[PDB]
Design a protein around this ligand. Structure first.
Ligand SMILES: *[C@@H]1O[C@H](CO)[C@@H](O)[C@H](O)[C@H]1NC(C)=O
Ligand SMILES: *[C@@H]1O[C@H](CO)[C@@H](O)[C@H](O)[C@H]1NC(C)=O
Lengths: 49, 49, 50, 49
């Protein structure tokens, strides 16, 4: 091991996802994290049941 | 304008999406917003009118 | 929220649209993902967003 | 005489197109270390140039 970086900040996460210590200048796509307390919604047609 | 209207309008082609409207949900997503949900982003034309 | 709307399962956000489509109950995009649905008891149409 | 000078650039987010935002899917995608990086880099560089 010679050097490490922690994937904690916004810029560091981009570096870890890009698998590189240096990020060329430009525009990079990203997605916010998804919640976990997701409720359940159900819609169904009433039929002979 | 003749060469931009006489020929078939690219409604089904590469037209950038109003990302500000695609996430509002005030109307069902059109072809442009539907592609945005799949990660496809048509960038604005470099040849600004 | 996680939804199962008319035998279609996915995760998204449901809102109310001022669209007045007359045909059907489910509207899907080219990829197959559900874009909206209609409530049969009242006629309101809802939109779905990731 | 007509000569084409530009083409509408298109960029795709690899994570959203293949996993549709499924949290469990994106964890499996990380095994394909060079898949998303190669696709996204090829499209982004062409758009910038
Ligand atoms: C629906 O609402 C949007 C946003 O307010 C508006 O631009 C559009 O014209 C409305 N259409 C109808 C059918 O009311
Ligand atoms: C039913 O439709 C009416 C139309 O004006 C609307 O005001 C009402 O909120 C809707 N309610 C439900 C429960 O769908």
């Amino acid at each position: 091991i010679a050097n490490i970086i922690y994937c904690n900040s916004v810029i560091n996460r981009l570096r870890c996802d890009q698998l590189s210590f240096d990020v060329p200048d430009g525009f990079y796509s990203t997605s916010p994290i998804q919640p976990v307390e997701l409720p359940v919604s159900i819609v169904s047609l009433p039929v002979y049941h | 304008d003749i060469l931009f209207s006489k020929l078939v309008t690219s409604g089904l082609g590469t037209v950038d999406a109003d990302y500000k409207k695609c996430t509002k949900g005030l109307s069902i997503a059109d072809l442009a917003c539907a592609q945005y949900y799949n990660g496809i982003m048509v960038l604005p034309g470099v040849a600004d009118a | 929220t996680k939804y199962n709307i008319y035998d279609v399962s996915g995760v998204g956000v449901i809102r109310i649209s001022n669209d007045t489509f007359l045909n059907g109950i489910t509207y899907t995009s080219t990829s197959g993902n559900l874009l909206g649905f209609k409530d049969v008891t009242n006629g309101t149409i809802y939109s779905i967003t990731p | 005489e007509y000569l084409q000078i530009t083409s509408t650039p298109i960029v795709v987010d690899c994570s959203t197109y293949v996993c549709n935002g499924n949290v469990r899917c994106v964890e499996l995608l990380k095994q394909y270390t060079s898949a998303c990086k190669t696709i996204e880099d090829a499209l982004r560089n062409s758009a910038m140039l």
